[PDB]
Design a protein around this ligand. Structure first.
Ligand SMILES: CC(C)(COP(=O)(O)OP(=O)(O)OC[C@H]1O[C@@H](n2cnc3c(N)ncnc32)[C@H](O)[C@@H]1OP(=O)(O)O)[C@@H](O)C(=O)NCCC(=O)NCCCC(=O)O
Ligand SMILES: CC(C)(COP(=O)(O)OP(=O)(O)OC[C@H]1O[C@@H](n2cnc3c(N)ncnc32)[C@H](O)[C@@H]1OP(=O)(O)O)[C@@H](O)C(=O)NCCC(=O)NCCCC(=O)O
Ligand SMILES: O=C([O-])CC(=O)C(=O)O
Ligand SMILES: O=C([O-])CC(=O)C(=O)O
Lengths: 426, 420, 145
């Protein structure tokens, strides 16, 4: 079946493709040859940019699947490593595959020591996302063979190096901002445990990994591992489409994730909640959000795709309660405020008409703060988890038969042709 | 004026927008609401991603304009700083505006000294593009904070050449040379890259003029992959310095800016004219992986106007430097002739692009192949920040977030490890 | 306010800083021969032992300059162990002269450190006041005037 597009008297048929799930799409790859026009879609929200087998999202139903598996099931049952294997390879690992996979990860968690010098280029008050962006970008220098696509196995190795090294770079970035000695990765700890250790171990006593926090971290990483064609993943695919070194591409993804409209929102959400401070102050805040020319937004609400509850936000809220309970905390003022803010927003026509609901960043900072993670590290934690999705998406993009460079068009609305004018006559 | 799209037994009208120049476009922003589908365009080649007043390209005619001015006129007459002012602001500067602009740039060419430590994080054999990407990304840490947009733009344009030169010096084990306020953009870059601690550096005017032209020729090129990456990362509200590192990452790819380094290696591997046939056969051997680097373009389906200027400039500079013959240039020109008369390339409308002749000129200026793409990045930083600024200042700017066609596994339940 | 008998207003209006330094340290205004010897000694001690550069790196870039001055001058005591316990009078003069000559260099480097600017060395052709301005404000991009 086809679709018909008619413009300026002329008509042409476009192929209609259907996926396993989700909306059908109209293939416009021959549109200019057929009708002499381009589509116009700033924001790309109505353009399917690629084929993918990694993640599926039904925005209207609030469904999220990774290689077919619902996010709730993975967050409840799986280890972060199983989900990393799944996103990267396509299937859950059997015991032998799992052991081989985790052995490969532990074999690449250590960083080349010269990298220490890079951290010294930063002021101690540097935002960790900047340290993460710059240092991952710098890491591309150590893997020059990756400036090349060529061999399949080499792409797997680049992906594994990035997934294994990002937690170490992130932890060292944190330690650097605190003036604390860098803590090395430990082979006897799993991905979640090891990150907590590298982040909080001190030189004066042995670190005791709290299983309550290890299980929370495991969940947090799974909930942020991948989310289809979001801005940062799209940046990774765009940069990677030129054949660029994957390490540099991940730095590009980190840059995009840092924006407050994307991953940076989790840091923004806790600051917003702290400023509201008390439930009595919610009305004043909601008024600013609803104020047409104020630009203030309800951080943690809204999504390009979800037009319903974000399944990750539901699990995130549930996890806040479970973790606080296990840590023996009877009350969390900020969690109480956030829940009340959600209810107020959800019963207000401004938000209902716009289909605005809590997204993954609304409840994440509350859990992270309870885990002892500082606000300055919320987006970096997101980046550590998301690196898995970024490299999985990059790998799929670059290995896909028929892969081409990503290079869009524009609608030129500038000055018409004019001749150069010498400086004296301007 | 509207266009009609019909699918499933349902039609809907879409607005048709017209630009100052170029093809009309069909506004599909309401397509999902109207018809329940998305368009499918991997590669984005048939999708206009934004409005822009910066640069216009007519690919079929081989036309390139910056704020309406033809690239040949700017390359012939303008100083690079005038072109930077033009791309950032929209008009050529008068004398007062120009003097104020160049003053601001010179006021920001110096780097925070702690930056020196970043370079030490690299092995001396690190590719300069890696040093550039990481170091510019790192710079975002030093600038955590409209006139602020202008200042960010000016800081990036003023600092990237210093970072680029220091990266080069680092790879050579040479002392870092500081920017000089008495030198213009092109002269200063040559000084920072080549001055030695054992004698005063004398800028060769022939090289300065060549550098000035090369910077102009690489300043901006509409929605190419790197600029698109900068715009996408920037659409989230991300720090512009980090967005430029993103652009540097994309530019490094051999299908993009990295092609200029790849061209000289290709030409060197061919060695002589008698070896062109074997190479062309590989390029036509569909499955070889081999491409004629420096040929082809997503938009141009005719000669790249920058390539014609690049070739003239190769000839002009070699003559001015007293070089009677350049075997490499002779080889490139013959390769161009052979490819252009072969049906494989004719049918696909493949022509030389900006990267085909640039390395040759750069090599003649004493710039090492390891620095070709970095020079591209230094010049393009102007386009990147101009595009970023236009994007972020535009009324109604939204995050860039595309869709996809899911073709993976249907929903299935998780099975525990013990049962796998 | 009198310094060795001289009213502050007269010194501020007519004396060079170096003349006042000599006055406070020795007791009398210097004649020309004494003035030349004194200032030659100061210029001969304005440069710091390069190992000192590392001390600045112990501070965060946002450190208050007084903290940098306090610690670095304290550290400077390590480079002059013979001063730990002085008996000879000529040695007290040399310690005094080294402190007067080096404090401006330490102060300017502290300032440059907080600004992320390259350290500027003292210049023998500049007097005490001019040299302090140069060390604090000269940039690597153009000659300082
Ligand atoms: C997430 C998102 C960037 C999606 O952007 P986008 O798909 O372009 O939304 P949109 O521009 O089509 O908005 C539609 C309407 O809802 C409004 N809106 C969107 N999000 C809003 C919010 N959080 N608060 C108030 N109003 C909002 C828009 O103003 C618009 O209203 P009008 O048509 O009257 O102008 C946006 O909802 C937002 O900025 N949310 C707050 C930031 C945030 O939480 N980001 C994290 C998202 C998840 C992640 O990436 O981690
Ligand atoms: C520049 C570009 C990446 C454009 O990519 P894209 O718009 O997707 O071209 P395309 O995929 O539609 O190619 C159309 C046909 O020409 C072929 N082709 C394209 N460029 C080719 C080249 N340089 N050599 C041989 N064949 C080429 C493609 O294989 C395709 O052939 P088939 O239909 O038989 O499969 C591509 O031409 C290329 O890789 N060129 C060589 C690399 C290069 O010089 N890059 C620099 C470009 C300028 C810059 O960014 O600096
Ligand atoms: O999907 C998006 O657009 C943003 C998002 O929620 C994520 O990346 O987790
Ligand atoms: O325009 C493009 O797609 C690539 C290009 O020539 C440039 O970025 O200079």
């Amino acid at each position: 079946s086809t679709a018909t597009i008619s413009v300026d008297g002329k008509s042409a048929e476009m192929p209609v493709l259907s996926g396993t799930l989700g909306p059908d799409v109209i293939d416009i790859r021959k549109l200019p040859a057929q009708l002499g026009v381009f589509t116009f879609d700033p924001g790309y929200g109505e353009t399917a940019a690629c084929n993918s087998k990694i993640t599926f999202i039904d925005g209207d139903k609030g469904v999220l699947l990774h290689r077919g598996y619902p996010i709730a099931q993975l967050a409840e049952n799986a280890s972060y490593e199983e989900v990393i294997y799944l996103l990267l390879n396509g299937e859950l690992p059997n015991k032998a595959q799992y052991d081989t996979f985790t052995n490969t990860l532990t074999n690449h968690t250590l960083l080349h020591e010269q990298i220490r010098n890079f951290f010294n280029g930063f002021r101690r008050d540097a935002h960790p996302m900047a340290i993460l962006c710059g240092t991952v970008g710098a890491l591309s220098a150590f893997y020059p063979d990756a400036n090349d696509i060529a061999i399949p196995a080499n792409r797997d190795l680049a992906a594994m190096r990035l997934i294994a090294k990002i937690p170490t770079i992130a932890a060292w970035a944190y330690k650097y901002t605190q003036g604390e000695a860098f803590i090395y990765p430990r082979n006897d700890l799993n991905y979640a445990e090891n990150f907590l250790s590298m982040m909080f171990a001190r030189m004066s006593e042995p670190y005791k990994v709290n299983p309550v926090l290890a299980r929370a971290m495991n969940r947090i990483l799974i909930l942020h591992a991948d989310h289809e064609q979001n801005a940062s993943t799209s940046t990774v695919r765009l940069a990677g489409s030129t054949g660029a070194n994957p390490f540099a591409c991940i730095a590009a993804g980190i840059a995009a994730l840092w924006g407050p409209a994307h991953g940076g929102a989790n840091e923004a959400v806790l600051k917003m909640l702290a400023r509201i401070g008390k439930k009595e102050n919610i009305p004043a805040f909601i008024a600013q959000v609803k104020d047409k020319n104020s630009g203030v937004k309800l951080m943690g609400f809204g999504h390009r795709v979800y037009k319903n509850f974000d399944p990750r936000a539901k699990i995130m809220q549930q996890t806040c309660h479970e973790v606080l309970t296990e840590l023996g905390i009877k009350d969390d003022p900020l969690l109480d405020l956030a829940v009340e803010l959600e209810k107020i927003a959800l019963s207000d026509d401004y938000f209902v008409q716009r289909k605005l609901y809590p997204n993954v960043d609304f409840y994440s900072g509350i859990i992270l703060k309870a885990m002892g993670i500082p606000t300055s590290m919320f987006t970096v934690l997101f980046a550590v988890a998301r690196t898995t999705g970024w490299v999985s998406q990059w790998k799929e993009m670059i290995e896909e038969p028929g892969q081409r460079i990503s290079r869009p068009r524009q609608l030129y609305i500038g000055a018409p042709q004019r001749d150069y004018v010498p400086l004296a006559k301007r």
